[PDB]
Structures are given as C-alpha cells and as structure tokens.
Amino acid sequence: SQIRQNYSTEVEAAVNRLVNLYLRASYTYLSLGFYFDRDDVALEGVCHFFRELAEEKREGAERLLKMQNQRGGRALFQDLQKPSQDEWGTTPDAMKAAIVLEKSLNQALLDLHALGSAQADPHLCDFLESHFLDEEVKLIKKMGDHLTNIQRLVGSQAGLGEYLFERLTL
Amino acid sequence: SQIRQNYSTEVEAAVNRLVNLYLRASYTYLSLGFYFDRDDVALEGVCHFFRELAEEKREGAERLLKMQNQRGGRALFQDLQKPSQDEWGTTPDAMKAAIVLEKSLNQALLDLHALGSAQADPHLCDFLESHFLDEEVKLIKKMGDHLTNIQRLVGSQAGLGEYLFERLTL
Amino acid sequence: SQIRQNYSTEVEAAVNRLVNLYLRASYTYLSLGFYFDRDDVALEGVCHFFRELAEEKREGAERLLKMQNQRGGRALFQDLQKPSQDEWGTTPDAMKAAIVLEKSLNQALLDLHALGSAQADPHLCDFLESHFLDEEVKLIKKMGDHLTNIQRLVGSQAGLGEYLFERLTL
Amino acid sequence: SQIRQNYSTEVEAAVNRLVNLYLRASYTYLSLGFYFDRDDVALEGVCHFFRELAEEKREGAERLLKMQNQRGGRALFQDLQKPSQDEWGTTPDAMKAAIVLEKSLNQALLDLHALGSAQADPHLCDFLESHFLDEEVKLIKKMGDHLTNIQRLVGSQAGLGEYLFERLTL
C-alpha cells in the first residue's frame, strides 16, 4: 500500500473481526425487532428500540470499514452467523440478551484498543475512543436503566408491567 | 463598615449559619439526584426533581450572601457536612427525607425572622418574606401532595406505583 | 452492577475524591466572588470572574458524577472543607490563590489519568482528555496572562492598576 | 374623612415630615448635579449620577403624597431648606455627603416603620418595605462601592483617579 503507515497486520485483522462482530450484532437486532412486531407479541416500542439498534450497529461496521481503507488495510468479510435465538421471550429476556451482546462488543473494543496501544498506534486508539467507547458506555447504561424498570414492573404483575413499559418508556 | 445601618451582629451571624444550611441542603439534593440516576434505581423524574432542588437551594444561599454584603455584614463560610445518607431508599423514603429537610429550613427562616423582628430590622423581615417564606410554603405543599400520591400508589403494588408516579407526575 | 465493565475500584474511589476536590474548588470560588462584592473591596469584574469559576467547578463535579453512574460506580460524598481563607487580599493575591488551586486540580486529573492508564481504562482516559485536561490548560494560561497584567499595573501604582485591570480586562 | 381607617395622626404627621425630607434630598442632589456641570469642575458622569438621584428622591416624595391621600390624611407642606453646601468639593467629598444624606433618609424610614408598628398599621409597614427600605439599602451599597473605588484611585494620583472614575464607572 502506498498509504499504509504504522498500521500493523494484527490491527488490520482484528478490525476485520470486529466488523463481523458489529454486522452480526446488527443481524441479531434485526431478529429481535421483527419478533416484537409479531401479532402474538405486539410491542411496537420494543420493536422500534431494537430496529434502531440494528441500524446503529450496521453503521459502526461501516465506520470501521471506512477506517480500514483510510489506513491502507484490506477489508475481508466472513459469513455472518444467524442470531443465537429464533424467539426472544419477554421484554426482560430480550433486554438481558441485548446487554450480554453489548458487553461482548464493548470487550472486543477494549481488546482492540489494548492491541493498538501495544502496537503504538494512537490513531486507532483515538478512533475507538471518539466513535465507539463512549457510545457503548452510554448504551449499556440506558439498557441497565431499562432492565431495572422492566424488573420493577414485571415483578408486580407481568403483562401489565410489560405493556406499561412499552407505552410509557419506549 | 461605611454602609452598615440597623444591622445587628446577631442577624449577621444567623445569616451566615442559614447560608451553611442552604448549601448543605443543596449538597443533600445533589446526592439524592445522583442516587436516582443509578442504573439499579433508574427513576429519571425523581433524579430531575431533586437536581432542580439542589440548584434552588444553592440560589437561596447566594441570595443570602448578596444580602449580607448589601447590609454590610461579612460572609463567613464553614465546612459543609456530607448528607446524612449515602443511599436514599425508595421514592417515598426520599420524599419524606426532603420534607424533613425543608421543614428544618423553614424553621430556620422562621427563627431568623423572629430575631430580625426582636432587633427591629424590617429590611431583613421583608427580605425573608419576599424570597423565602412563601417559596418554602409552596414547596412543602407540593412535596406533601407528592407523598400522598406516592403513598396511594405504593400501597397498591410497590414497583408499579413507583414507576407510574415517576412517569405520570414527575 | 449489571452494567459495570473494566471499571476498577481504584478509579471509582479516585473519581469520588476528585468530585470532592471540584466541589471544594467551587466553594472556594464562591467565597472569592462574594469577598470582591464587599462594599470595602468593590471590584465587580473580579467578583464575576470568580463566581463564573464556581459554576464551572460545580459543573465539573457533576460531569464526574454522571460518568461515575454511567460506569456503574457509586457516588460517595464527604464533608466539604471550608475555603482556606476568609478574606482574600488584593486582586493579585486572589489570582495567585486561584492558580495554586487550579494547578492542584490539574495534578489530580493527571494522577487519575495515570491511574486509568495503569488499569487499562481508555474510556476514563478519553473522558478526562475531552472535558477536563484542555479546559485546565486554557484556564491556567488565562490566569497566567492576568497575573502578568495585574503585576505590570500594581507595580506602577497599586490602587490605580487594580481599578484599571478590573475595568479594562475583566 | 370618609375613607380613613387605622391611620393615626402620628403617622400622618411623620409622613408629612418625610415628604419634606425627600424633597430636600432632591434639592440637595439638584445642587450637587449642577455643581459638577460647572466648567471648572466638568465631571459629566458625576453630574448625571446626582441629577438622576434628584429625580428618584422627588418620586419618593410623590409616592408618599399619593399614599397620604389613599389613607385619608392631609398633605401639609413646609419650607424646603436650601442644601447645606453651595460648593461640593471633589467626587469623594460629594459621595460622602450623599452617603450621609441617604443614611439619614434610611433612619427616618426606619423610624416611621417602628411608629407604624407601634400603632399596629401594617399597610404603612408594607408600603415602606415594598418601595423604600430595599431601594435605600441598594443605593447605599452602590455609594459604598463607589466611595471605595474613588478612594483607591485618588489615593494613587488625585486628578487622574477622579477623571478615570467618571469615565470608566460613571
């Protein structure tokens, strides 16, 4: 590459893997969204919540792909595994699953940052800090807050709490 | 002081103490607000309610400090004791604590007024009447109304009532 | 905590201490501001300068508290020590004291950053860099410039220089 | 009087005297203002400062006269003594004289209030509190601040300080 400078093969590879991870997260949120659109689930607020996340994760991937090209690495795509569930249970079930997924993306970002740091690659480190690390922290806090609120409500009386959360928070 | 007229050392001292009392009330409301921002508490309406009060109490203090200087007394600051709790329980717990605090500020205002009256200091008396006495009466009424409403709701079914109060009143 | 990830107990504690440090700086600037509002000091520009800083430091604290909750740590408040002086001397005296205070906040930020770095916590490091490290550098430069200008003026003829600085710079 | 209720002859008399006091203060400020308009004094800022006060004191008198009629008392006018000086010296001299005058008006208001209070006349007390007591406190604070600033400047170098105060504060 005529442009590549201070960009390790290890970061390049890891960025490719994180692209797969983001695209898979998107795919998972697509599935979550359409499950909550089912006539026998019918929680529009929850549907919209996850469809909006599908988009955000797809955008992350694209931002990572743009950066890959800017640095002179080569995007390599792998198969996207289907989501881990076909049916997603109740709102709390879905929100827990979303938290688990986000923590795994966050840890992958944290790992990539540690790698860029070991490879003395400050452009990578700033890139992750500016567009990914804070976004994740804020999203996981928000999911945390929702889980707490769902749990307060579905303890009381389950169907009622689930409706009211969708109506008044989402 | 070239400006000081009809301003007793006793009022001056008492104003300094009431400044500490207001700043401490502010600090207490800061703590209440951020507790309700915790991901495992997650009641934004309650958070905003108390953060707005923190500001109001800080403003009271500042108004008292401005008045001190206008009269020719000297502001003297003391340590601010931390709030009396680190964790604030449920919305009713927090609202009761807020009522207790406000009644204590109100009584301190009532005491200062009695003092200004004994010292024949009508400027002080009008100052407290115009900016503090009615504000307190209205705030304690509002807290009263909220407590009643929280108690009606958390009697029925606790987590549900607490969510609904935050959503529909706050 | 359901949200806490890569957030050490050491950072959590240190953030709590830095909150106390910021709130205490705010309290110090409150005192500085109202001293310069005294009828026998009467430098409105200096008063406004420090009252504006009181607000900025309170905001820092609040930003740190928000971040604490976002990361899943627990805000813990301690007593706020009164400011180190009751009377603040002349403008240069006050500005030197302000520089001393700011350097101590800056060093506390630098220490916290080093800690986050030792604990491989890049979210913390980016947080301090984005909202605190540059703000401090710029504020200390500005105070530096003011001190130089006050010193040039109060060397010449003290009361005159102090009036002219308040009027024409502040 | 068909309207008079709870309005003592003592308050009525005292209000008449306070009207004379306000009109005399106005007359004094008229004199101060035109002295500073002299080609051999020539301080326009000081001139405007006192001419504006002449108006304010005339307005006080008129407000007191309006109140007298509203309560059913009878306005009685006496001679207005000329001001106590024909020439008013330097800005500090004039400002000290203004402070002395204002303190005497303030004490007369304080006395009238004490009287209304002894005569259980709360309308009088509220009237003085709403339009006079705070206005005086704020005006005497402002004069206090000016005196301090003039004294800082005319200590340094007298003619220079006096010009700069008129130019940059007034």
Compute CA distances C3 → A112, A129, B34, B45, B110, whole Å: 20, 19, 16, 21, 46
Q: Binding site annotation covers D10?
A: no
User: Is the CB of A144 inside 8 Å of chain C's CB atoms?
Assistant: yes
**Are A and D close enough to touch, i.e. 3+ CB pairs under 8 angstroms?**
no
- Go through the domains of chain A in sequence order and give each one's CATH number: 1-170 (1.20.1260.10)
Tokens 């330097």: give the residue: D90
Q: What angle do CA C141, C142, C146 make, to 5 degrees?
A: 115
Task: Name the token pair of D128.
Answer: 């003085």
Contact indicator for A167, A126 with CB cutoff of 8 Å: no
For every residue of chain C, which 3-state class applies, written as one string? CCCCCCCCHHHHHHHHHHHHHHHHHHHHHHHHHHHHCCCCCCCHHHHHHHHHHHHHHHHHHHHHHHHHHHHCCCCCCCCECCCCCCCCCCHHHHHHHHHHHHHHHHHHHHHHHHHHHHCCCHHHHHHHHHHHHHHHHHHHHHHHHHHHHHHHHHHHCHHHHHHHHHHHCC
CA distance C35 to chain D (A): 13
| Reported structure resolution in angstroms | 2.2
- Is residue D158 within a helix (H) or strand (E), and if so which, with residue range? helix D158-168
Sequence-separated (6 or more) residues with CB below 8 Å from residue B169 = B45, B146, B149
CB < 8 Å & 24+ apart, contacts of D159-167: D160/C160, D161/C159, D161/C160, D162/D43, D162/D90, D162/D91, D163/D43, D164/C160, D164/C163, D164/C164, D165/C163, D165/D45, D165/D91, D166/D43, D166/D44, D166/D45, D166/D46, D166/D91, D167/D45
Looking at residue C88, its amino acid is W
Q: Which residues are B80's β-sheet partners?
A: C80
Task: Name the token pair of C29.
Answer: 């600037």
Q: Can you point out the beta strands (E) in chain D?
A: none
Contact indicator for B90, B102 with CB cutoff of 8 Å: no
Closest CA to C126 of A11, A125, A136, A114: A125
Sequence-separated (6 or more) residues with CB below 8 Å from residue A93 = none
User: Is the CB of B137 inside 8 Å of chain C's CB atoms?
Assistant: no
What is the sign, positive or negative, of the torsion defined by CA atoms of C85, C87, C93, C94?
A: positive
Give phi and psi for B80, each to the nearest 5.
-100, 115
Contact indicator for C15, A116 with CB cutoff of 8 Å: no
Please tell me the distance from the alpha carbon of residue C135 to that of residue C141, in angstroms, as a whole number: 10
Tell me how the structure was determined.
X-ray
Please tell me the distance from the alpha carbon of residue C7 to that of residue C123, in angstroms, as a whole number: 9
Please tell me the distance from the alpha carbon of residue C32 to that of residue C38, in angstroms, as a whole number: 10
User: Is the CB of B168 inside 8 Å of chain A's CB atoms?
Assistant: yes
Length of chain B in terms of residues written:
170
* CB half-sphere exposure, B156, CA atoms < 13 A: 15
User: Among all residues of chain C, which has the CA nearest to that of D163?
Assistant: C160
- Closest in B42, B167, B168 to A148, CB measured: B42
Sequence-separated (6 or more) residues with CB below 8 Å from residue B62 = C30
User: Is the CB of C107 inside 8 Å of chain B's CB atoms?
Assistant: no
CB atoms within 10 A of CB C33: 24
Compute CA distances C72 → A142, B148, C1, C128, whole Å: 12, 32, 6, 17
Q: Which residues are C80's β-sheet partners?
A: B80
Closest CA to C51 of C29, C36, C35: C29
Q: What angle do CA D41, D45, D47 make, to 5 degrees?
A: 60
Contact indicator for C34, B69 with CB cutoff of 8 Å: yes
CB < 8 Å & 24+ apart, contacts of D22-25: D22/D57, D22/D58, D22/D60, D22/D61, D22/D64, D22/D105, D23/D57, D23/D58, D23/D61, D23/D80, D24/D80, D24/D81, D24/D83, D25/D57, D25/D101, D25/D105
Please tell me the distance from the alpha carbon of residue B93 to that of residue D71, in angstroms, as a whole number: 52
User: Among all residues of chain D, which has the CA nearest to that of B123?
Assistant: D133
Sequence-separated (6 or more) residues with CB below 8 Å from residue D142 = none
